[PDB]
Amino acid sequence: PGVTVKDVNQQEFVRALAAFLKKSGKLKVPEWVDTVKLAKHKELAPYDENWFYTRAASTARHLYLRGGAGVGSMTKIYGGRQRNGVMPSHFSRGSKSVARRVLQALEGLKMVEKDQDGGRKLTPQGQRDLDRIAGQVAAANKKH
Amino acid sequence: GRVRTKTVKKAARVIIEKYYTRLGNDFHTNKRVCEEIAIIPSKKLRNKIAGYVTHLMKRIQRGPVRG
Amino acid sequence: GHQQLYWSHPRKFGQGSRSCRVCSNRHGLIRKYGLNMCRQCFRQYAKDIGFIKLD
Amino acid sequence: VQISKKRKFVADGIFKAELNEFLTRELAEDGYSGVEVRVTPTRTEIIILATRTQNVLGEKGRRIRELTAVVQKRFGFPEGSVELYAEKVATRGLCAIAQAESLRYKLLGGLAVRRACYGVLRFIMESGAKGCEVVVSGKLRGQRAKSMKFVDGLMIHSGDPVNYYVDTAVRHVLLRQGVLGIKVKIMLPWDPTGKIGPKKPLPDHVSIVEPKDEILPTTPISEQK
Amino acid sequence: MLMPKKNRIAIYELLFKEGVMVAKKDVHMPKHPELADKNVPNLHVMKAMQSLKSRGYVKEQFAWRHFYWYLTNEGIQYLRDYLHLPPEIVPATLRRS
Amino acid sequence: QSVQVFGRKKTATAVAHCKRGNGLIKVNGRPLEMIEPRTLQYKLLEPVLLLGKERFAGVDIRVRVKGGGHVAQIYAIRQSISKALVAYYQKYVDEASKKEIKDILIQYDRTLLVADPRRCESKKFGGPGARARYQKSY
Amino acid sequence: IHRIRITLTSRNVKSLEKVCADLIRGAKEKNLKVKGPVRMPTKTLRITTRKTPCGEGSKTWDRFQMRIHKRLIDLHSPSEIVKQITSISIEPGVEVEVTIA
RNA sequence: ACGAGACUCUGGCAUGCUAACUAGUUACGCGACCGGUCGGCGUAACUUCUUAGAGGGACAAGUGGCGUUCAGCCACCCGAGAUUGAGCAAUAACAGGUCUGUGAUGCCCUUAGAUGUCCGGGGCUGCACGCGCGCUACACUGACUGGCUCAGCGUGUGCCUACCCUACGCCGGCAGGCGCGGGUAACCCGUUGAACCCCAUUCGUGAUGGGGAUCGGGGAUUGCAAUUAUUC
C-alpha cells in the first residue's frame, strides 16, 4: 500500500524523522550544537542539543509541505517573537546562516537539495523513505 | 428607533390619496406601483414609503382613517 | 556666487532636503505617493489632487 | 515612462492642482471660471472655461500663446504636445468661482460690500438658483472684525447632495485695512437632461405624477379602432 | 557680482525665443540642467529678476516656488534696443494656439 | 467538480469540492481528525457524529479553507462540510433525507449552515479600538 | 503582434464603465473576438492628516480616500485595427494604454 | 424652510447576470497496493470560492402582547441581515488656536546685522523638582530549543536622489557586504509560513531565566562624521 507525509500526526512524525537522521549519519556532522543562540530574537539557551538534526527534519517537512523553500524563506518559518527589553515585542527573522548550513547539510545528500534557478527537486530515494517513515509511524502505534 | 419621518409619511399619504385603486395589501406590489407612479430616487426611501403604504392600507381595512 | 562657503556639508539625508512644494515648509510634510505636501496645503488642494472625504 | 499607477495618478493630481493654482493667481482677472484637461495620445489639451474669452485671447492673440510657453518651462512637457483652448463658460450664473471673482472685483472697484452682495444675490436668483449665501467676514467697520451673511432661497448644508447641488467658492478679497474673506455658496437648481442642474433630484424629494382623468366605464363595449 | 554680459545675452535670447526661462531661487542647486553649460547660477536668476522688476518691462508672478515673466511690447522694444537686434525678431508663431 | 456550496466564518472561507466516493473526508492534505488544535477537534468532529458516520459514507468531499486565525479557520471547515452534505443530498438523491439532516443540524446549531455575519469593526482616531478612547486628564 | 492588451485606468467608475461599453461596442461593430472586460481589484489610497493647521483642539483626522479602478481587455487583432478601434469614442477621466501581449 | 432623517462609502446574502493563462475551480504522462496525498503534480466539466460592475435584497414586512386602541414599543416562527460603522452635519457665537503657510495680510527693521545670502559649534537629549499619555511587570492561567498548522489592511523599482519591497545561493554564532535579479505590481516579495495551540526529559514561591543603565567591552549602513551618543 501507500501512505504520504501530510496524513500523519506531525509531532511524532518529526520525532521519527529526527531519530532517522540520528541513526543515518549520512549528513555532515554539525559543528555548532550549543555554541550559538539559534534565532536572533531568542537570547535564551537551547536545550534539546539536537537542534541541527531536528531543524533539518523540520526543513524537510517544510519543503514537502511547500516545495521551493530555502534560506530567506527558512528564516521566515523560523522567525519568532523578539522582546526588545523595555519596549514591546516584535517579529524577528531567525539566523540565515544556521538555516543555510542546515540546507547545505541536506544539499546533495539524496533526499532534498536546493538548486540555483528556483524550486526544490525531490529524489525518489528520499520521498520513498520519508513516505515509508510516515506509514510506519501511522500504522505502528497511531493506527491499528 | 423605527419612527417614520414626515417625508415618508407624507409621500405615502399622497400615494394612498391619489393612487388608491392600484395599491394593494401586499408590500411588494406597493413597492412596484410606487416605483412606477412616482420618482423616488432611493431604494431605501421607496421601501419606507411602501411599508407605510401597506400599514395605511391595513388601517383602512380596520375602517376609518383619521389622517 | 556663494559656492565657496555653502555646500560645506551636503544636505541629502535630513528634513532640510525635503520641503513643501508650495510654501517651502519643512514642517508636517507628507511624502506618501510622492505628494511632497504639507498638511495645510494638502487639505487646501485635497479635492483637486483626487482625494475626496468619504470614509 | 514606466511608473506604478498609484504614483501616476497622484502626480497627475498634483499636476492638475499646479495648473489650477497657477491660473487662479494668473487668469483670475480675465473672468476665470475653470479648466478642463483632456488626455490624447502623447498630448494634453487644456480647455479653459471663462466668462471673458476676448480678454484671455487678447490683442494679436498674444496672451493665449504666451501661457503655453510659460507652463512649458515648469512642467517640462514635450514641445508641441501642449496646447490650450480658451472658451466662454457654459455655466454663467451657476459656477461659484465666477460670481466669487465678480464679488472680488466689485469690492475692488469701489462698491459697497452689502450692495455688491445684494447685487450678486439678485443676479444669482435671476439665473434661477434655488438659493444663495454670501458669508463675508472681516473688518467691515472699525477695527472689531465681524462676519456678515446674505442667505436667500433655500440651501442644504449636510449630506452627499451638498457635493453636487452646491457650488462653493472661498476667496480672499483685498482691503485697505486688511484682508476680507468671501464665501459664495450657490445651490444649483435641478433640471433633467439639461445643462444647468444635476440629472438627479434631491434624494429627500419625492415627485408624484398626477394620474389620468379617464372616465370609469359603466357598460362593457366593443371598440373598433 | 560681476554678472557676465555673455550670459546676459544668452538669457535674453532664451527669453525672447519663447517668453519664459527656467527660474528658481534655490541655492542648493548651482545650475539647473537647462541653465547649465552656460555659467548660470542662482544669483544670476536673482539679479535678472530684480533688474526686470525695477525696470518693469516684464511683470513678475510667483507661484509654487516658481517665477513667471509677462513679456510686454515695451519689453520687446527695450530688449531690441539694448541688444541691438534686427527689427524682424519677434515671437509670432501662429500654429496651434 | 464541486457542489458549489462554500462556507465562511470571520474573514475565513472554506469550500468542499464534492465527488462520488465512500465518505473519506480530507482537509487540505489532512483528514478531518488530524487537525492541529486537538481541543477544537470536537468542533471539527461536530457534524460527523452529530448525524452519524453512515451519512458520511457515500460522498467524498475535500474541504479547502483559506482565512485568518486557527479558530476562525474552524467554524468554516465544519459549516462547509455540513452545508456541502446538505446541498449534495438536495441536488442528487432527494429532499426528505436532506430535509431531515437540515432539521437535525439546525436544531443542534442554527448557525450550522448560515454564515456568522459579524466582522471586525473599524478603528476611529483618538482611541486604540473601535469603542475604546484615549485617556485624558481633567 | 497578434495578442494586444488594452489597459483602462480610471478613478471614476462611471467614465470607466462608459469607456468599456464604447470599446466593446466598437469591437462589436466589426466582428472581432473579444474577452470580457477584466476588472482588477480597486486601489484605495487611504491617507490620513490632521484637520487643524495647528495643534489646538481635539484629535481630529481627515481621512482622504482616492480609489483607482483597473480594466484589462485582451484581443487578437492587427495593430491597425486596434488603433482604429481605440480612438473611436472616449470620455475624459479614463487613461487608455495599448500594450504588447 | 434649514438641522435630524433622507444621502454616500462601508459590513453582511444572492450558485441570478455582464466574465477574467496579472485567480483558481475543472484538464494527468509515479496511479508509489490489486479506490486514494499534490501548492511531493510523478512537467479543453468554467466563475464556485478571488476579483465591487449593473440589478436585487429589509420595509417593523407576518403573527402575538401592550398602546389615545394612533404614533409606536416588546416577543417570535421565518430570513444573510430584524439597530454595522463612519462621512457630511443648521441658527448663532467664543476676543478658543493659528501672523511659525506666502504681496493673502493693516504697523516697526532705511545710516554697511535687509533675513532677499548665511551658521564651525552647541538648545528644548543636561537639572533639587511637581505633572500628563503609554509600554515592560505583577505568576506558577506565568515559562526555560519551540518541533506543526493561517490570514487582514496595505506599501513597494524616483526626473529634484543609490536614497524601494526584495525572491535565491556565498561569506559569519553577528550587525553587514557579493552576484543573478522578480516586481512600475491580483504578474515578485506573497500561498504575506509572526502572535498562538502542543510536549510518554529539565523553572518551583527566589529576587529570581515573571524582569532592565542586566554598569563595561566586542558592532557598523553604495549617506558628515552616533558626543548625556534617539540606529545597532
GROMACS .gro file of N, CA and C (backbone and C1' of nucleotides) in nm, chain A residues 1 11 14 32 36 38 40 42-43 47-48 58 62 64-66 70-73 76-77 80-81 85-86 88 91 93 95-97 100-101 104 114 127-128, chain H residues 32-33 37 40 135-137 143-149 167-176 190-196 198 200-202 209 212-213:
model
  380
    1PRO      N    1   0.082  -0.122   0.000
    1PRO     CA    2   0.000   0.000   0.000
    1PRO      C    3   0.085   0.127   0.000
   11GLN      N    4   0.366   1.565   1.510
   11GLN     CA    5   0.452   1.562   1.628
   11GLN      C    6   0.544   1.440   1.627
   14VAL      N    7   0.776   1.421   1.307
   14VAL     CA    8   0.904   1.489   1.308
   14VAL      C    9   0.997   1.426   1.411
   32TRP      N   10   2.845   2.327   1.517
   32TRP     CA   11   2.790   2.401   1.629
   32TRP      C   12   2.663   2.330   1.673
   36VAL      N   13   2.579   2.845   1.974
   36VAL     CA   14   2.504   2.954   1.913
   36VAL      C   15   2.380   2.983   1.998
   38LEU      N   16   2.096   3.032   1.817
   38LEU     CA   17   1.995   2.998   1.717
   38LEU      C   18   1.932   3.122   1.655
   40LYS      N   19   1.780   3.503   1.626
   40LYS     CA   20   1.820   3.635   1.674
   40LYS      C   21   1.730   3.682   1.787
   42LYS      N   22   1.587   3.514   2.002
   42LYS     CA   23   1.599   3.427   2.118
   42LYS      C   24   1.734   3.447   2.184
   43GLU      N   25   1.733   3.503   2.305
   43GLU     CA   26   1.853   3.517   2.387
   43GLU      C   27   1.849   3.423   2.506
   47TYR      N   28   1.800   2.368   2.436
   47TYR     CA   29   1.803   2.254   2.526
   47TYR      C   30   1.830   2.122   2.455
   48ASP      N   31   1.753   2.089   2.351
   48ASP     CA   32   1.748   1.952   2.300
   48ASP      C   33   1.884   1.902   2.252
   58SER      N   34   1.279   1.945   1.030
   58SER     CA   35   1.179   2.049   1.012
   58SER      C   36   1.189   2.113   0.875
   62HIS      N   37   0.911   2.121   0.581
   62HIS     CA   38   0.862   2.245   0.523
   62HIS      C   39   0.882   2.250   0.372
   64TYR      N   40   0.851   1.967   0.197
   64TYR     CA   41   0.748   1.875   0.149
   64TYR      C   42   0.611   1.940   0.152
   65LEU      N   43   0.580   2.014   0.259
   65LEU     CA   44   0.453   2.087   0.259
   65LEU      C   45   0.451   2.193   0.150
   66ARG      N   46   0.562   2.264   0.132
   66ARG     CA   47   0.572   2.373   0.036
   66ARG      C   48   0.704   2.359  -0.039
   70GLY      N   49   1.366   2.788   0.085
   70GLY     CA   50   1.509   2.794   0.112
   70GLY      C   51   1.542   2.892   0.222
   71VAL      N   52   1.669   2.931   0.233
   71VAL     CA   53   1.708   3.033   0.330
   71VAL      C   54   1.663   3.169   0.278
   72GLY      N   55   1.621   3.255   0.370
   72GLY     CA   56   1.544   3.373   0.338
   72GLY      C   57   1.398   3.342   0.356
   73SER      N   58   1.357   3.223   0.313
   73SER     CA   59   1.227   3.168   0.349
   73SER      C   60   1.235   3.090   0.480
   76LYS      N   61   1.193   3.280   0.749
   76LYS     CA   62   1.055   3.324   0.767
   76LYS      C   63   0.967   3.216   0.831
   77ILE      N   64   1.007   3.088   0.824
   77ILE     CA   65   0.936   2.989   0.905
   77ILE      C   66   0.997   2.977   1.044
   80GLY      N   67   1.039   3.452   1.500
   80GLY     CA   68   0.959   3.445   1.620
   80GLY      C   69   0.955   3.576   1.695
   81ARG      N   70   0.892   3.573   1.812
   81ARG     CA   71   0.876   3.693   1.893
   81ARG      C   72   1.011   3.741   1.945
   85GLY      N   73   1.322   4.429   2.521
   85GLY     CA   74   1.355   4.481   2.652
   85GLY      C   75   1.244   4.567   2.709
   86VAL      N   76   1.275   4.695   2.731
   86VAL     CA   77   1.176   4.787   2.786
   86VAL      C   78   1.065   4.817   2.686
   88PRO      N   79   0.795   4.718   2.368
   88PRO     CA   80   0.714   4.599   2.340
   88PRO      C   81   0.785   4.503   2.246
   91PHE      N   82   0.835   4.100   1.571
   91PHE     CA   83   0.872   3.979   1.499
   91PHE      C   84   1.017   3.991   1.453
   93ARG      N   85   1.328   3.778   1.223
   93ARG     CA   86   1.377   3.667   1.143
   93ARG      C   87   1.482   3.590   1.222
   95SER      N   88   1.814   3.295   1.210
   95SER     CA   89   1.951   3.300   1.162
   95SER      C   90   1.955   3.245   1.020
   96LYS      N   91   1.994   3.330   0.925
   96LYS     CA   92   2.006   3.282   0.788
   96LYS      C   93   2.126   3.190   0.772
   97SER      N   94   2.232   3.211   0.850
   97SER     CA   95   2.348   3.123   0.842
   97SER      C   96   2.315   2.983   0.894
  100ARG      N   97   2.101   2.816   0.646
  100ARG     CA   98   2.184   2.789   0.529
  100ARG      C   99   2.271   2.666   0.551
  101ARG      N  100   2.333   2.655   0.669
  101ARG     CA  101   2.414   2.538   0.699
  101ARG      C  102   2.329   2.412   0.708
  104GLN      N  103   2.272   2.316   0.347
  104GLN     CA  104   2.394   2.259   0.291
  104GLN      C  105   2.420   2.119   0.346
  114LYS      N  106   1.852   2.216  -0.278
  114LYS     CA  107   1.800   2.337  -0.341
  114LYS      C  108   1.891   2.378  -0.456
  127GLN      N  109   1.192   1.060  -0.108
  127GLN     CA  110   1.046   1.059  -0.095
  127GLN      C  111   0.995   0.921  -0.057
  128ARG      N  112   1.050   0.815  -0.117
  128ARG     CA  113   1.010   0.680  -0.079
  128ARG      C  114   1.039   0.654   0.068
  859A        P  115   0.082   0.155  -0.882
  859A      O5'  116   0.235   0.163  -0.839
  859A      C5'  117   0.299   0.289  -0.825
  859A      C4'  118   0.383   0.295  -0.701
  859A      C3'  119   0.316   0.254  -0.571
  859A      O3'  120   0.306   0.114  -0.553
  859A      C1'  121   0.435   0.455  -0.537
  860C        P  122   0.196   0.054  -0.452
  860C      O5'  123   0.204  -0.103  -0.474
  860C      C5'  124   0.215  -0.191  -0.363
  860C      C4'  125   0.081  -0.246  -0.322
  860C      C3'  126   0.016  -0.345  -0.417
  860C      O3'  127   0.069  -0.476  -0.405
  860C      C1'  128  -0.145  -0.186  -0.347
  864U        P  129  -0.650   1.154  -0.138
  864U      O5'  130  -0.537   1.261  -0.106
  864U      C5'  131  -0.493   1.286   0.027
  864U      C4'  132  -0.353   1.340   0.027
  864U      C3'  133  -0.324   1.444  -0.080
  864U      O3'  134  -0.363   1.575  -0.041
  864U      C1'  135  -0.156   1.279  -0.085
  867G        P  136   0.266   2.018  -0.368
  867G      O5'  137   0.420   2.013  -0.329
  867G      C5'  138   0.466   1.917  -0.234
  867G      C4'  139   0.571   1.825  -0.289
  867G      C3'  140   0.577   1.812  -0.441
  867G      O3'  141   0.654   1.916  -0.499
  867G      C1'  142   0.583   1.596  -0.341
  962C        P  143  -0.046   5.036   2.721
  962C      O5'  144   0.104   4.985   2.716
  962C      C5'  145   0.167   4.954   2.592
  962C      C4'  146   0.317   4.949   2.606
  962C      C3'  147   0.372   4.838   2.694
  962C      O3'  148   0.382   4.714   2.626
  962C      C1'  149   0.476   5.043   2.749
  963U        P  150   0.343   4.577   2.701
  963U      O5'  151   0.473   4.541   2.786
  963U      C5'  152   0.596   4.511   2.722
  963U      C4'  153   0.711   4.510   2.820
  963U      C3'  154   0.692   4.423   2.944
  963U      O3'  155   0.719   4.286   2.921
  963U      C1'  156   0.765   4.636   3.011
  964A        P  157   0.628   4.175   2.991
  964A      O5'  158   0.646   4.204   3.147
  964A      C5'  159   0.557   4.148   3.242
  964A      C4'  160   0.599   4.180   3.384
  964A      C3'  161   0.499   4.142   3.492
  964A      O3'  162   0.511   4.006   3.530
  964A      C1'  163   0.583   4.361   3.531
  970A        P  164   0.395   3.338   2.950
  970A      O5'  165   0.509   3.227   2.960
  970A      C5'  166   0.645   3.261   2.940
  970A      C4'  167   0.732   3.209   3.052
  970A      C3'  168   0.874   3.170   3.013
  970A      O3'  169   0.963   3.280   3.002
  970A      C1'  170   0.778   2.998   3.143
  971C        P  171   1.081   3.275   2.894
  971C      O5'  172   1.164   3.144   2.933
  971C      C5'  173   1.173   3.034   2.843
  971C      C4'  174   1.292   2.948   2.876
  971C      C3'  175   1.311   2.823   2.791
  971C      O3'  176   1.369   2.850   2.664
  971C      C1'  177   1.342   2.768   3.018
  972U        P  178   1.318   2.768   2.536
  972U      O5'  179   1.436   2.783   2.431
  972U      C5'  180   1.409   2.800   2.293
  972U      C4'  181   1.497   2.714   2.208
  972U      C3'  182   1.447   2.688   2.067
  972U      O3'  183   1.477   2.793   1.978
  972U      C1'  184   1.511   2.483   2.166
  973G        P  185   1.360   2.889   1.924
  973G      O5'  186   1.271   2.792   1.834
  973G      C5'  187   1.130   2.809   1.827
  973G      C4'  188   1.059   2.676   1.817
  973G      C3'  189   0.907   2.685   1.819
  973G      O3'  190   0.851   2.579   1.741
  973G      C1'  191   0.980   2.559   2.004
  974G        P  192   0.915   2.536   1.599
  974G      O5'  193   1.014   2.417   1.636
  974G      C5'  194   1.084   2.345   1.536
  974G      C4'  195   1.037   2.202   1.524
  974G      C3'  196   0.895   2.184   1.469
  974G      O3'  197   0.888   2.067   1.389
  974G      C1'  198   0.909   2.092   1.687
  975C        P  199   0.860   2.079   1.232
  975C      O5'  200   0.703   2.059   1.219
  975C      C5'  201   0.628   2.130   1.122
  975C      C4'  202   0.481   2.118   1.148
  975C      C3'  203   0.398   2.243   1.122
  975C      O3'  204   0.365   2.258   0.985
  975C      C1'  205   0.341   2.153   1.333
  976U        P  206   0.366   2.404   0.917
  976U      O5'  207   0.212   2.436   0.895
  976U      C5'  208   0.120   2.333   0.862
  976U      C4'  209  -0.011   2.351   0.935
  976U      C3'  210  -0.083   2.483   0.912
  976U      O3'  211  -0.158   2.485   0.792
  976U      C1'  212  -0.075   2.437   1.144
  994A        P  213   1.375   3.845   0.076
  994A      O5'  214   1.347   3.750  -0.049
  994A      C5'  215   1.219   3.692  -0.070
  994A      C4'  216   1.217   3.600  -0.189
  994A      C3'  217   1.334   3.504  -0.201
  994A      O3'  218   1.319   3.389  -0.119
  994A      C1'  219   1.297   3.607  -0.410
  995C        P  220   1.441   3.341  -0.027
  995C      O5'  221   1.543   3.274  -0.130
  995C      C5'  222   1.499   3.175  -0.223
  995C      C4'  223   1.605   3.146  -0.326
  995C      C3'  224   1.743   3.116  -0.270
  995C      O3'  225   1.757   2.981  -0.231
  995C      C1'  226   1.761   3.274  -0.446
  996G        P  227   1.867   2.940  -0.121
  996G      O5'  228   1.978   2.861  -0.204
  996G      C5'  229   2.106   2.838  -0.148
  996G      C4'  230   2.216   2.886  -0.240
  996G      C3'  231   2.342   2.936  -0.172
  996G      O3'  232   2.428   2.832  -0.130
  996G      C1'  233   2.277   3.091  -0.336
  997C        P  234   2.509   2.847   0.008
  997C      O5'  235   2.616   2.961  -0.022
  997C      C5'  236   2.722   2.938  -0.114
  997C      C4'  237   2.828   3.045  -0.105
  997C      C3'  238   2.867   3.089   0.035
  997C      O3'  239   2.953   2.998   0.102
  997C      C1'  240   2.834   3.279  -0.100
  998C        P  241   2.940   2.981   0.261
  998C      O5'  242   3.015   3.108   0.320
  998C      C5'  243   3.150   3.134   0.284
  998C      C4'  244   3.188   3.278   0.308
  998C      C3'  245   3.179   3.327   0.452
  998C      O3'  246   3.287   3.285   0.533
  998C      C1'  247   3.085   3.488   0.307
  999G        P  248   3.264   3.171   0.644
  999G      O5'  249   3.249   3.252   0.781
  999G      C5'  250   3.208   3.187   0.900
  999G      C4'  251   3.151   3.285   0.999
  999G      C3'  252   3.022   3.244   1.068
  999G      O3'  253   3.041   3.159   1.180
  999G      C1'  254   2.995   3.459   0.980
 1000G        P  255   2.925   3.056   1.223
 1000G      O5'  256   2.808   3.150   1.278
 1000G      C5'  257   2.677   3.098   1.299
 1000G      C4'  258   2.616   3.149   1.428
 1000G      C3'  259   2.579   3.297   1.430
 1000G      O3'  260   2.454   3.324   1.369
 1000G      C1'  261   2.704   3.248   1.622
 1001C        P  262   2.449   3.420   1.240
 1001C      O5'  263   2.489   3.563   1.296
 1001C      C5'  264   2.398   3.640   1.373
 1001C      C4'  265   2.454   3.777   1.405
 1001C      C3'  266   2.483   3.867   1.286
 1001C      O3'  267   2.368   3.934   1.237
 1001C      C1'  268   2.664   3.872   1.440
 1002A        P  269   2.357   3.974   1.082
 1002A      O5'  270   2.294   4.120   1.083
 1002A      C5'  271   2.225   4.171   1.196
 1002A      C4'  272   2.288   4.299   1.244
 1002A      C3'  273   2.322   4.399   1.134
 1002A      O3'  274   2.213   4.480   1.095
 1002A      C1'  275   2.512   4.366   1.270
 1003G        P  276   2.189   4.512   0.939
 1003G      O5'  277   2.333   4.557   0.887
 1003G      C5'  278   2.356   4.582   0.749
 1003G      C4'  279   2.500   4.564   0.711
 1003G      C3'  280   2.526   4.519   0.568
 1003G      O3'  281   2.525   4.626   0.475
 1003G      C1'  282   2.650   4.383   0.716
 1017G        P  283   0.772   3.569   0.075
 1017G      O5'  284   0.669   3.522  -0.037
 1017G      C5'  285   0.580   3.414  -0.014
 1017G      C4'  286   0.443   3.442  -0.070
 1017G      C3'  287   0.438   3.470  -0.220
 1017G      O3'  288   0.320   3.414  -0.276
 1017G      C1'  289   0.349   3.654  -0.102
 1018U        P  290   0.330   3.290  -0.378
 1018U      O5'  291   0.201   3.203  -0.346
 1018U      C5'  292   0.070   3.258  -0.358
 1018U      C4'  293  -0.004   3.255  -0.227
 1018U      C3'  294   0.072   3.310  -0.106
 1018U      O3'  295  -0.018   3.377  -0.019
 1018U      C1'  296   0.006   3.087  -0.065
 1019U        P  297  -0.065   3.527  -0.054
 1019U      O5'  298  -0.048   3.605   0.084
 1019U      C5'  299   0.011   3.543   0.197
 1019U      C4'  300   0.157   3.579   0.211
 1019U      C3'  301   0.219   3.550   0.347
 1019U      O3'  302   0.357   3.519   0.329
 1019U      C1'  303   0.236   3.780   0.301
 1020G        P  304   0.405   3.366   0.313
 1020G      O5'  305   0.363   3.299   0.451
 1020G      C5'  306   0.438   3.322   0.570
 1020G      C4'  307   0.394   3.230   0.681
 1020G      C3'  308   0.490   3.222   0.799
 1020G      O3'  309   0.416   3.204   0.920
 1020G      C1'  310   0.467   3.008   0.700
 1021A        P  311   0.415   3.320   1.031
 1021A      O5'  312   0.553   3.301   1.109
 1021A      C5'  313   0.555   3.278   1.249
 1021A      C4'  314   0.588   3.404   1.325
 1021A      C3'  315   0.528   3.415   1.464
 1021A      O3'  316   0.606   3.346   1.561
 1021A      C1'  317   0.489   3.616   1.345
 1022A        P  318   0.591   3.374   1.719
 1022A      O5'  319   0.437   3.407   1.741
 1022A      C5'  320   0.382   3.407   1.872
 1022A      C4'  321   0.297   3.530   1.895
 1022A      C3'  322   0.173   3.511   1.982
 1022A      O3'  323   0.204   3.519   2.121
 1022A      C1'  324   0.121   3.644   1.791
 1023C        P  325   0.266   3.394   2.201
 1023C      O5'  326   0.206   3.267   2.127
 1023C      C5'  327   0.130   3.170   2.200
 1023C      C4'  328  -0.015   3.172   2.159
 1023C      C3'  329  -0.080   3.035   2.146
 1023C      O3'  330  -0.218   3.045   2.181
 1023C      C1'  331  -0.082   3.142   1.936
 1025C        P  332  -0.367   2.286   2.388
 1025C      O5'  333  -0.227   2.242   2.327
 1025C      C5'  334  -0.156   2.130   2.380
 1025C      C4'  335  -0.070   2.065   2.276
 1025C      C3'  336   0.036   1.969   2.329
 1025C      O3'  337  -0.015   1.840   2.355
 1025C      C1'  338   0.135   2.118   2.175
 1027A        P  339   0.349   1.438   2.746
 1027A      O5'  340   0.436   1.310   2.786
 1027A      C5'  341   0.400   1.226   2.895
 1027A      C4'  342   0.481   1.099   2.893
 1027A      C3'  343   0.630   1.116   2.864
 1027A      O3'  344   0.705   1.153   2.978
 1027A      C1'  345   0.542   0.946   2.726
 1028U        P  346   0.735   1.307   3.010
 1028U      O5'  347   0.893   1.321   2.997
 1028U      C5'  348   0.953   1.450   2.982
 1028U      C4'  349   1.090   1.456   3.045
 1028U      C3'  350   1.141   1.595   3.077
 1028U      O3'  351   1.091   1.644   3.201
 1028U      C1'  352   1.309   1.475   2.963
 1029U        P  353   1.020   1.787   3.209
 1029U      O5'  354   1.120   1.874   3.298
 1029U      C5'  355   1.201   1.813   3.397
 1029U      C4'  356   1.335   1.881   3.407
 1029U      C3'  357   1.330   2.032   3.425
 1029U      O3'  358   1.310   2.070   3.560
 1029U      C1'  359   1.480   1.980   3.251
 1036G        P  360   1.833   3.432   3.747
 1036G      O5'  361   1.768   3.326   3.647
 1036G      C5'  362   1.637   3.274   3.669
 1036G      C4'  363   1.540   3.326   3.565
 1036G      C3'  364   1.424   3.232   3.533
 1036G      O3'  365   1.309   3.310   3.497
 1036G      C1'  366   1.551   3.269   3.338
 1039G        P  367   1.351   4.351   3.109
 1039G      O5'  368   1.350   4.478   3.206
 1039G      C5'  369   1.339   4.609   3.153
 1039G      C4'  370   1.438   4.703   3.216
 1039G      C3'  371   1.545   4.757   3.121
 1039G      O3'  372   1.586   4.887   3.166
 1039G      C1'  373   1.649   4.633   3.291
 1040A        P  374   1.614   5.005   3.061
 1040A      O5'  375   1.741   5.081   3.120
 1040A      C5'  376   1.854   5.009   3.168
 1040A      C4'  377   1.983   5.083   3.146
 1040A      C3'  378   2.106   4.996   3.123
 1040A      O3'  379   2.120   4.958   2.988
 1040A      C1'  380   2.154   5.161   3.287
   0.00000   0.00000   0.00000
